Amino acid sequence: IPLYALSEGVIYANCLATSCKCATTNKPIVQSTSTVITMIDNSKCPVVE
Amino acid sequence: VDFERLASIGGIKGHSKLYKIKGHPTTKDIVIKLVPNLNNLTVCSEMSIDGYLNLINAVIIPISQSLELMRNNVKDGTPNENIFGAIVAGAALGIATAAQVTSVVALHKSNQNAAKINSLRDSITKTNQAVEQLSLGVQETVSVLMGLQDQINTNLVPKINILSCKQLSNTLNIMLLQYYSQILTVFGPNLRDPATVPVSIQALSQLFEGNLELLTSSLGISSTDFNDLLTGKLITGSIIWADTQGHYLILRVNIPDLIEVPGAVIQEFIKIGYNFGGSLWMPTIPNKIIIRGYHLSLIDSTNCIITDNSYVCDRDYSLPMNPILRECFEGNTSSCGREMVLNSYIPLYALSEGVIYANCLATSCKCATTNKPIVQSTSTVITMIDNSKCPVVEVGKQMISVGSYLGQVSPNNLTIEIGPPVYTEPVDITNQLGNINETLSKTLDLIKQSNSILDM
Amino acid sequence: VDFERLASIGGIKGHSKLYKIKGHPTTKDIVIKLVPNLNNLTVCSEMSIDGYLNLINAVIIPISQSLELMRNNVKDGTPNENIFGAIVAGAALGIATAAQVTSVVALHKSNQNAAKINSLRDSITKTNQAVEQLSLGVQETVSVLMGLQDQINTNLVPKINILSCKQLSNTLNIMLLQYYSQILTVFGPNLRDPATVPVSIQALSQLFEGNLELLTSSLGISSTDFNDLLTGKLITGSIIWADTQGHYLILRVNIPDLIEVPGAVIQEFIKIGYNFGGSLWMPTIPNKIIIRGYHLSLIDSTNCIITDNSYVCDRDYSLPMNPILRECFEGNTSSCGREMVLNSYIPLYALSEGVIYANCLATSCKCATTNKPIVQSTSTVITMIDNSKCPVVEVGKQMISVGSYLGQVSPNNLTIEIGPPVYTEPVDITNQLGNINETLSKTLDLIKQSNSILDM
Amino acid sequence: VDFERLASIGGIKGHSKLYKIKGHPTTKDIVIKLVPNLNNLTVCSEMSIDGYLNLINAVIIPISQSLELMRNNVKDGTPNENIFGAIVAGAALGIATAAQVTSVVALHKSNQNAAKINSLRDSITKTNQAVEQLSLGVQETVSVLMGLQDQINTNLVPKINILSCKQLSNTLNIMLLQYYSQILTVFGPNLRDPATVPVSIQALSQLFEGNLELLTSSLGISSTDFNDLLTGKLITGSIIWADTQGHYLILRVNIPDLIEVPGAVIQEFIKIGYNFGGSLWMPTIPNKIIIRGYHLSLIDSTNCIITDNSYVCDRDYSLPMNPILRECFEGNTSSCGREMVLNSYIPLYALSEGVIYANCLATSCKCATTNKPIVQSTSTVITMIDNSKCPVVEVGKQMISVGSYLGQVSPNNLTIEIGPPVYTEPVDITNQLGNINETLSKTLDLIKQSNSILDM
Amino acid sequence: QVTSVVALHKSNQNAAKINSLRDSITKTNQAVEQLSLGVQETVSVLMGL
Ligand SMILES: *[C@@H]1O[C@H](CO[C@@H]2O[C@@H](C)[C@@H](O)[C@@H](O)[C@@H]2O)[C@@H](O[C@@H]2O[C@H](CO)[C@@H](O[C@@H]3O[C@H](CO)[C@@H](O)[C@H](O)[C@@H]3O)[C@H](O)[C@H]2NC(C)=O)[C@H](O)[C@H]1NC(C)=O
Ligand SMILES: *[C@@H]1O[C@H](CO[C@@H]2O[C@@H](C)[C@@H](O)[C@@H](O)[C@@H]2O)[C@@H](O[C@@H]2O[C@H](CO)[C@@H](O[C@@H]3O[C@H](CO)[C@@H](O)[C@H](O)[C@@H]3O)[C@H](O)[C@H]2NC(C)=O)[C@H](O)[C@H]1NC(C)=O
Ligand SMILES: *[C@@H]1O[C@H](CO[C@@H]2O[C@@H](C)[C@@H](O)[C@@H](O)[C@@H]2O)[C@@H](O[C@@H]2O[C@H](CO)[C@@H](O[C@@H]3O[C@H](CO)[C@@H](O)[C@H](O)[C@@H]3O)[C@H](O)[C@H]2NC(C)=O)[C@H](O)[C@H]1NC(C)=O
Ligand SMILES: *[C@@H]1O[C@H](CO)[C@@H](O)[C@H](O)[C@H]1NC(C)=O
Ligand SMILES: *[C@@H]1O[C@H](CO)[C@@H](O)[C@H](O)[C@H]1NC(C)=O
Ligand SMILES: *[C@@H]1O[C@H](CO)[C@@H](O)[C@H](O)[C@H]1NC(C)=O
Ligand SMILES: *[C@@H]1O[C@H](CO)[C@@H](O)[C@H](O)[C@H]1NC(C)=O
Ligand SMILES: *[C@@H]1O[C@H](CO)[C@@H](O)[C@H](O)[C@H]1NC(C)=O
Ligand SMILES: *[C@@H]1O[C@H](CO)[C@@H](O)[C@H](O)[C@H]1NC(C)=O
Ligand SMILES: *[C@@H]1O[C@H](CO)[C@@H](O)[C@H](O)[C@H]1NC(C)=O
Ligand SMILES: *[C@@H]1O[C@H](CO)[C@@H](O)[C@H](O)[C@H]1NC(C)=O
Ligand SMILES: *[C@@H]1O[C@H](CO)[C@@H](O)[C@H](O)[C@H]1NC(C)=O
Ligand SMILES: *[C@@H]1O[C@H](CO)[C@@H](O)[C@H](O)[C@H]1NC(C)=O
Ligand SMILES: *[C@@H]1O[C@H](CO)[C@@H](O)[C@H](O)[C@H]1NC(C)=O
Ligand SMILES: *[C@@H]1O[C@H](CO)[C@@H](O)[C@H](O)[C@H]1NC(C)=O
């Protein structure tokens, strides 16, 4: 089952089961309680793990 | 020592090695000649030797004068009913320490063998080889030696007629100035008082192009095990004669032996950084712990070579441990302390007997047999991992397997006692001037302001 | 940071350099042969090789045993949907750190290429000349050199019949013992655990008479610019094989690259003495301040070489400071400490952007065109001098011209907050401890009383 | 300073030596050429010199560019009608210190003699000997020198036709890379700024096989007395020209002179362990005290050589001391601190002008004249022993004679005022001001509860 | 698709190594051949017709 995908530089990622990080800051990314699918763009970090 | 609570605060028990100290040195006598013996160079040598001799006389003569003047300060003879003891005229010493007295006693013991070797002065000056032996007695021999005899027995010797004699004289002059610089380098502190200063075998080996085990094999001591291989930088020696006629030095060196102090175990440790309060803290605990019969002390390996199985020191370096630091290594690990580590080269996980101690909040933890991540417990910061959770472990980027068990009780479940932060600056001493002066005459204000109304 | 207040307290802003860290190392393999290949000396060399072989076999075998035990600790396995690699046994490793696991994974990675190099053992042993690079085709390569092969290809070879063969045997014995001392010297710590300890490249060059540029050119690194000419002491790398048959060691080294941390600037400072209260004080500030986007950190350039324009560290060495240091650097000259000096080698004037910061209380200050003295103002301690006062300046004996402009405000008209004198003593700590003890035992007695006299 | 009270607390007055500082240096100009003028090797040398030239040009050109850039900012012709001197362009320097300005003035002074030597460039480049002299003027001379010119005039020359030309070219290549590595080693910090950095004579000496004495003899300094033999490691010198045509470096060195500071006597001290409280302690005093007209201060001989009669420093190192330490040295043994030792290498007895200071509690003390033991007095700790008690004394194992007397004041009957047991502060005592200060900030909360006491 | 991107970025060096023997590829006159990629490595060039 895929849990992340890319759409025009937009990452939809289920970070509850997938590791999510920003190595500009070297921190993990956690799951919000208001949503399950995780929105990721360059506003959080431009280079993503 | 409790390794569970000390692992919970962040210190991991490393290897345990032995402690062995050099003891009982026996003596052996070497001789070092200084004037190079040219015998094939009688055709073209000029008198370039005279400049070298005038350079080295200023080293040879006052060393020998100080040696015989220290020799005059000790005499033998009976003090009345007492038999002997090498009675030392204390008015002839000025200011002297215990080691100088011991060295003077050593040269008084070695006067007889120094005279015995000095009887073979013409035997010393007739050598034309690099290193060879001469029979001192029926079962004793001497170890006369030169590193630079070979260089004017294999290099300047074949160019006796191919090259011009003035160029051999110039090259011999350059080599003699270089070698006189070498003796001026090695006998630097030895010119001050050449009777109490010990002599390193390494700086002696620098006179012979850095060949340590040539000198060791000519001495006769032979290493055969792993421990005596890295051992070899701690052989000491003493000047016993400084003869000006043949321009040589008779030296007495000591053959070492690594005796073992019983019950002493050198314990190593691993320090990791743990994230508490949003900050990465490092514990303030030392590395090497000497333990001997329930006694914790400090040592320094500033000069001690470390083997795979033991600690080898030239001399015992037992320093007292702080009793606060002893109680740190006891169950009161809140008295240990911690400091900031923001640098990236801080380890977060380590292995010990199939046991993984991992700070899992910053390091990824999962088990591929179960394909689930591992979460930090709220009651601890250091994370225990063994085969009970998963025998096959992923930590960070690396894939491992584990074994064994916890050990007495698990260090993850008990409560934690967090110490104070530690700073190292004299600015903190001025701040302790300031905040005690914020408090001291405010504590005097407690003393005043309480008693003002406690009367009624 | 406020440079005007820092100039008032006595610090002058020095240069600004960059910061670069070694990063992204690719791997290149070499081999190091130990047995010298004598081919011309097959007429008379005796069996002088035998003692050298017996000496090196004591230090060849256990490294090989340790490395194959390191390969035995790892096992290429895959439980379920694993990464199909790594996997070490926790019981078979004992106690280890993260870097030891990394070294084990590096051995498990490069075992294939180690077998690839070991396939050409007869090609390794037939190298008549010393330095050659071979390859495994178009991609992958290996290198080999011997610092002693030339000495038995241009020095010991031509005296094959002019000199006696026993003298060649003795000279080769002396040379082999010297070189065995050199390998014994460089692999000092390498005998303990020859998998997790890197190899200093300068100590490797010491085996070959200190020629770092020969191995630099033969390795493939060809530095051209200013910054990489001094750099080259940061090669590093670990051994991968210790083959006994051909008597060679297969080594893997890392080709470095200097990456740049963004936004980080190293700042230097100049500390001068100021005469306050009839006393000469120096400011107590660190010399180097690294800034990266409003973030002051501390660094130590103990192993870091400094070029004309940047800082070259092998790895990042960030250290923290107290927030009182941040107050000292930003706004609070009262929080900045001071120290007492009386020595003569204290500078009192300096130059910055054509602006003279000079203590005129001890140094003569005049303007030569007007021929008038410059007097210390009572409001300031450090004197600012620009071309507004005089473009032609005479300081002490020196004759200077100034220019440019001031910059925001002058430091002389701002008030100066002199901090407490930083001067510590263990006696001060001890009697402070006694003072604190007696005062809190007074206060705890009165607090027990005042808590018992709450309710009247 | 009171030696009797300081002997009562356990410190013995050592030797008294003088203090000498290097001062008033004159300057001598030398030249160092780089390209080896091979003349006998015009048949088989190939163009192996070209790689050496391209390697050294990237070093030589930027040094010359920075050298001409630093001398381009200084100008003569003072606009003041009476004063005349050298003016630097302070706007063009940017940031500079006092020593940099003084160095620029020095090169401005030496530019004329640099051009005078540069007029003899073809004389410099035509030398085929190792070290020789040329006619600079009617009485001035230069000291052009090469260490490697001997090696291609006594070693590489005679194998001109016996050995193959490519082998000579490869040997020349290896030697050129090794020597180019040596110039890269010595001119490390000089590449950043070759104007304000002096050059050590020993760093120059490793370019010529570590021959400091050859450079000392060719320079003109001829040390004859015992004090100047050890001196010579502190010779300073700076470059004045960096010529790229002949690829040579014109250097200016400073001939030193050891002046003597008046009235300053350096004093040594011997710290003996004393058994108080069943415990072995040591006094906390510095080893060396400089006294100059009743002025106790501190020095550090970290770079200063120590002779038998004097202390020789390259530059004055007067350090201040605490007034509590001055009271400790003068009158207040209660102000003197003590530290704990338990290690075996603590001497408990020493000699001073025939005066035995011996702690008899641990060391066996006897009188051989009477065959009785000597008991420790309860009023003192360190045992005074002179000829008044017994002339022939047994201490430890040793027979020792004694001499002199008490001098002025007897320490054997004097009262004891051993001060506080002061403690070292490695990392821990900061948390003893960090766990006790929070008890103080519990009492700061008790100030708020004392306000409640006042209110209720 | 991201995994395929990583696969081509992982194998472009070996693709260049195989492309280095383009003239060796076109000279085959039999059905199936094995040509040496490296020291102990090979590929399979093949033409059933
Ligand atoms: C080292 O010791 C020798 C031996 O002297 C003995 O030891 C000394 C420490 C003293 O205790 C001496 O009394 C004792 O004998 C010293 O050699 C001696 O030197 C002295 C001069 O210092 C010589 O005396 C001279 O001898 C002749 C007699 O014709 C004349 O030149 C002079 O008038 C003068 O008296 C003496 O002969 C000599 N030998 C002996 C056996 O005493 C030596 O000086 C001493 N110290 C040093 C630093 O070398
Ligand atoms: C390093 O590993 C090799 C390979 O062995 C493999 O790895 C080990 C860690 C274990 O997991 C093994 O089960 C596994 O096969 C070891 O070499 C092996 O050594 C053993 C002895 O220790 C050999 O057994 C001997 O074989 C013959 C049988 O005729 C007789 O001489 C003896 O009776 C004895 O049984 C074995 O053949 C050998 N090879 C293999 C493939 O197993 C190696 O010992 C090990 N460790 C070290 C320190 O070298
Ligand atoms: C070192 O100083 C020299 C000398 O110049 C003098 O000092 C300078 C600091 C300035 O104050 C100058 O005004 C003063 O004369 C400098 O060399 C000079 O450089 C300039 C270029 O900057 C040269 O001009 C060139 O000349 C020819 C004309 O045909 C052409 O190549 C160019 O079009 C250009 O105009 C000039 O000739 C030269 N010499 C003199 C005597 O002025 C030098 O720049 C300075 N700095 C360094 C780093 O070397
Ligand atoms: C060189 O000296 C040795 C040793 O004394 C001697 O055997 C040999 O004959 C000498 N050679 C010549 C050519 O004189
Ligand atoms: C230290 O531990 C002991 C038991 O070993 C306990 O009695 C004591 O209260 C502890 N002290 C602390 C935590 O300060
Ligand atoms: C730790 O305590 C928990 C309960 O808090 C218990 O389940 C566990 O077995 C303990 N671990 C031991 C005793 O090793
Ligand atoms: C507080 O400052 C005074 C001087 O004002 C000083 O004497 C005292 O020792 C200081 N208090 C401390 C250091 O606790
Ligand atoms: C010395 O060895 C070289 C290299 O193998 C060879 O060319 C030469 O002929 C040999 N010379 C002798 C005398 O054996
Ligand atoms: C420190 O500086 C700030 C402004 O940056 C100022 O408000 C404050 O009063 C200063 N504190 C002192 C001098 O203690
Ligand atoms: C410094 O302040 C004084 C008044 O105190 C004023 O005359 C002078 O111009 C000021 N200098 C500046 C702002 O550079
Ligand atoms: C202060 O220090 C000692 C330890 O040095 C402690 O035992 C004592 O109770 C304290 N108080 C006094 C008055 O000495
Ligand atoms: C070697 O050079 C010297 C000095 O230039 C010269 O006198 C001599 O003739 C030369 N010899 C040969 C064989 O070229
Ligand atoms: C220090 O010694 C002086 C006399 O030299 C004396 O007056 C003073 O009381 C002493 N102070 C002490 C012992 O604290
Ligand atoms: C030391 O004092 C005692 C009395 O306390 C006295 O008998 C003795 O002579 C004194 N020693 C001297 C002054 O040298
Ligand atoms: C002083 O106490 C406070 C509050 O307990 C604490 O934060 C601080 O670190 C202490 N000071 C030192 C120097 O440890």
Q: Which residues does C290 contact at the CB level (< 8 Å), separation at least 6?
A: C19, C264, C265, C266, C267, C296, C297, C298, C299, C318
Q: How was this structure determined?
A: cryo-EM
Rounded CA-CA distance B24/B257 in Å is 6
Both structure tokens of C17: 């350099």
Rounded CA-CA distance B189/D109 in Å is 40
Q: Directed axis angle between helix C61-73 and helix C98-118, to 10°?
A: 110
Minimum Cα–Cα distance from B188: chain D residue: D230
Pairing status of strand D141-142 against strand B141-142:
unpaired
**Best residue of E40, E41, E42, E43 to probe chain C, by most C CBs closer than 10 Å:** E40
Q: Give the residues surrounding ligand 11 with Cβ less than 6 Å away.
A: C 437-438, 441
User: How would you class A4 by CB atoms within 10 Å of its CB: exposed for 0-12, middle for 13-18, buried for 19 or more?
Assistant: middle
Of B166, B142, B146, residue with least CA distance to B154: B146
| CA angle at B261 for the pair B260 and B264, rounded to the nearest 5° | 115
Q: What distance, in Å, lies between the first and last C-alpha atoms of chain C? A: 56
Q: Which residues does D49 contact at the CB level (< 8 Å), separation at least 6?
A: D35, D176
Decide whether any atom of ligand 2 lies within 6 Å of the C72 Cβ: yes
B267 touches B288 (CB < 8 A): yes
D357 touches D9 (CB < 8 A): no
B355–C184 CB contact, under 8 Å:
no
Both structure tokens of B164: 């011009």
Coil vs helix vs strand at D273: coil
Pocket test for ligand 3, best of D66, D72, D88 (most atoms within 8 A of CB): D72
DSSP state of C133: E
Of C114, C119, C137, C126, residue with least CA distance to C30: C114
Distance from CA of D333 to the nearest CA of B (A): 23
Beta strands (DSSP E) in B23-171 are 26-33, 95-96, 134-135, 141-142
Decide whether any atom of ligand 5 lies within 6 Å of the B25 Cβ: no
Rounded CA-CA distance D96/C349 in Å is 10
Rounded CA-CA distance B40/B57 in Å is 25
Rounded CA-CA distance C239/C242 in Å is 8
B342 touches B328 (CB < 8 A): no
Phi, psi of B403 (to 5 degrees): -165, -165
Both structure tokens of D76: 């003569």
Alpha-helix residue ranges (DSSP H) falling in B282-332: 323-328
Residues 177-196 of B with CB under 8 A from C: none
Decide whether any atom of ligand 14 lies within 6 Å of the D410 Cβ: yes
Beta strands (DSSP E) in D177-318 are 237-241, 248-255, 258-271, 274-276, 279-283, 289-292, 296-297, 305-306, 310-313
| CA angle at C373 for the pair C367 and C378, rounded to the nearest 5° | 120
C284–B426 CB contact, under 8 Å:
yes
Rounded CA-CA distance B218/B196 in Å is 25
Q: Which residues does D408 contact at the CB level (< 8 Å), separation at least 6?
A: D4
Bridge partners of A13, per DSSP, are A4, A38
Distance from CA of C66 to the nearest CA of E (A): 28
Phi, psi of C212 (to 5 degrees): -70, -30
DSSP D370-419: TTEE-PPPSS-SSEEE-TTT-SEEEETTEEEE--S---S--SSSS-----
Decide whether any atom of ligand 10 lies within 6 Å of the C409 Cβ: yes
Rounded CA-CA distance B202/C184 in Å is 13
Pocket test for ligand 6, best of B4, B406, B409, B416 (most atoms within 8 A of CB): B409
Rounded CA-CA distance B107/B196 in Å is 10
Q: What's the C39 CA to ligand 8 centre distance in angstroms?
A: 7
Of B285, B304, B234, residue with least CA distance to B17: B304
Pairing status of strand D398-401 against strand D392-395:
antiparallel
Rounded CA-CA distance D137/D139 in Å is 5
**Best residue of C97, C102, C327 to probe chain B, by most B CBs closer than 10 Å:** C97
**Best residue of C148, C154, C343 to probe chain D, by most D CBs closer than 10 Å:** C154
**D427 touching C (Cβ < 8 Å):** no
Sign of CA dihedral E35, E37, E43, E48: negative
**E17 touching C (Cβ < 8 Å):** yes
Rounded CA-CA distance D268/D99 in Å is 34
Rounded CA-CA distance D242/B166 in Å is 33
Strand D305-306: give its sheet, edge to edge.
Answer: D296-297, D289-292, D258-271, D11-22, D310-313, D305-306
Coil vs helix vs strand at D97: coil
Minimum Cα–Cα distance from B395: chain C residue: C98
Rounded CA-CA distance D311/D230 in Å is 12
Of B127, B144, B114, B197, residue with least CA distance to B32: B144
Distance from CA of C341 to the nearest CA of B (A): 16
Pairing status of strand C11-22 against strand C258-271:
antiparallel
Using CA atoms, how far residue D76 sits from B158, C372, C404, D83, D258, in Å, is: 61, 22, 21, 11, 34
- Please give the single-letter amino acid code of residue B309: N
- Please give the single-letter amino acid code of residue C132: E
Rounded CA-CA distance C427/E1 in Å is 72
C344 φ/ψ sector (left φ>0, alpha ψ -120 to 50, else beta) = alpha
DSSP state of C247: T
Rounded CA-CA distance B59/B46 in Å is 24
Tell the residue number behind the tokens 């045509």, with chain if given: D245
Coil vs helix vs strand at C118: helix
Bridge partners of B296, per DSSP, are B291
Q: Which chains neighbour C (Cβ–Cβ under 8 Å, 3 or more pairs)?
A: B, D, E
Count of CB pairs separated by less than 8 Å, B with C: 179
Pocket test for ligand 11, best of C433, C437, C438, C442 (most atoms within 8 A of CB): C437
Residues 317-336 of C with CB under 8 A from B: 317-320, 322, 324-325
Distance from CA of E49 to the nearest CA of C (A): 32
CA B421 to chain centre: 33
Radius of gyration from C-alpha coordinates of chain B? 33
Q: What is the dihedral of CA D82, D88, D90, D95, to 10 degrees?
A: -140
Q: What is the resolution of this structure in A?
A: 5.9
D347–B97 CB contact, under 8 Å:
yes
DSSP state of C8: H
Which residues in chain B are contacts of C429 at CB distance < 8 A?
429
Rounded CA-CA distance B389/B444 in Å is 58
Q: What's the B425 CA to ligand 9 centre distance in angstroms?
A: 22
What is the helix (H) or strand (E) element at residue B249, kind and residue range? strand B248-255
B408 φ/ψ sector (left φ>0, alpha ψ -120 to 50, else beta) = left
Q: Whose CA is nearest to atom 2 of ligand 12?
A: D40
Q: Which residues in chain E precede a discontinuity of more than 2.5 Å between C and N?
A: none
**B73 touching C (Cβ < 8 Å):** no
Coil vs helix vs strand at B308: coil
C322–B427 CB contact, under 8 Å:
yes
**D422 touching B (Cβ < 8 Å):** no
B350 φ/ψ sector (left φ>0, alpha ψ -120 to 50, else beta) = beta
D339 touches D360 (CB < 8 A): no
C90–B400 CB contact, under 8 Å:
yes
Q: Whose CA is nearest to atom 10 of ligand 4?
A: B40
Rounded CA-CA distance C204/B308 in Å is 23
Rounded CA-CA distance D357/D271 in Å is 11
Decide whether any atom of ligand 6 lies within 6 Å of the B88 Cβ: no
Bridge partners of B224, per DSSP, are none
CA atoms within 13 A on the CB side of B101: 27
Which residues in chain C are contacts of B345 at CB distance < 8 A?
315-316
Pairing status of strand C365-367 against strand B319-320:
unpaired
Distance from CA of B111 to the nearest CA of D (A): 18
Both structure tokens of B91: 């008015």
Tell the residue number behind the tokens 């088989």, with chain if given: D44
Of B144, B147, B122, residue with least CA distance to B31: B144
Of D88, D46, D60, D5, residue with least CA distance to D187: D60
B176 φ/ψ sector (left φ>0, alpha ψ -120 to 50, else beta) = alpha
User: How would you class C245 by CB atoms within 10 Å of its CB: exposed for 0-12, middle for 13-18, buried for 19 or more?
Assistant: exposed
**C372 touching D (Cβ < 8 Å):** no
B446–C449 CB contact, under 8 Å:
no
Decide whether any atom of ligand 5 lies within 6 Å of the B334 Cβ: yes
Rounded CA-CA distance D182/B348 in Å is 42
Tell the residue number behind the tokens 């990392």, with chain if given: D427
| Three-state secondary structure string covering chain E | CHHHHHHHHHHHHHHHHHHCCHHHHHCCCCCEEEEECCCCCEEEEECCC
B355 touches B384 (CB < 8 A): yes
Both structure tokens of C324: 């009182």
| Three-state secondary structure string covering B188-239 | CHHHCCCCCCCEEHHHHHHHHCCCHHHHHHHHCCCCCCCHHHHCCCCCEEEE
Of D39, D49, D53, D242, residue with least CA distance to D126: D39
Rounded CA-CA distance B399/B403 in Å is 14
Distance from CA of C20 to the nearest CA of E (A): 28
Using CA atoms, how far residue C112 sits from C17, C68, C116, D3, in Å, is: 44, 14, 6, 74
Coil vs helix vs strand at D213: helix
D307–B171 CB contact, under 8 Å:
no
Coil vs helix vs strand at B328: helix
Using CA atoms, how far residue B456 sits from B253, C114, C444, in Å, is: 85, 91, 21
Rounded CA-CA distance C102/C109 in Å is 10
C380 touches C8 (CB < 8 A): yes
| CA angle at C320 for the pair C318 and C323, rounded to the nearest 5° | 150
Rounded CA-CA distance D143/D30 in Å is 5
Both structure tokens of D51: 């790689």
B182 touches D205 (CB < 8 A): no
Coil vs helix vs strand at C18: strand
B339 touches B347 (CB < 8 A): no
Q: Whose CA is nearest to atom 43 of ligand 3?
A: D72
CA atoms within 13 A on the CB side of B303: 10
Q: Which residues does C338 contact at the CB level (< 8 Å), separation at least 6?
A: C276, C281, C282, C283, C284, C418, C419, C420, C421, C422
Rounded CA-CA distance B312/D440 in Å is 46
Q: Which residues does B420 contact at the CB level (< 8 Å), separation at least 6?
A: B337, B338, D431, D434, D435, D438
**B159 touching D (Cβ < 8 Å):** yes
Using CA atoms, how far residue C368 sits from C349, C355, C393, in Å, is: 17, 17, 6
D101 touches D94 (CB < 8 A): no
Both structure tokens of D290: 């400089």
Of D179, D177, D115, residue with least CA distance to D147: D179
Using CA atoms, how far residue D285 sits from B203, D13, D306, D336, D338, in Å, is: 32, 12, 20, 8, 9
Helix-then-strand count for chain D, H and E = 11, 24
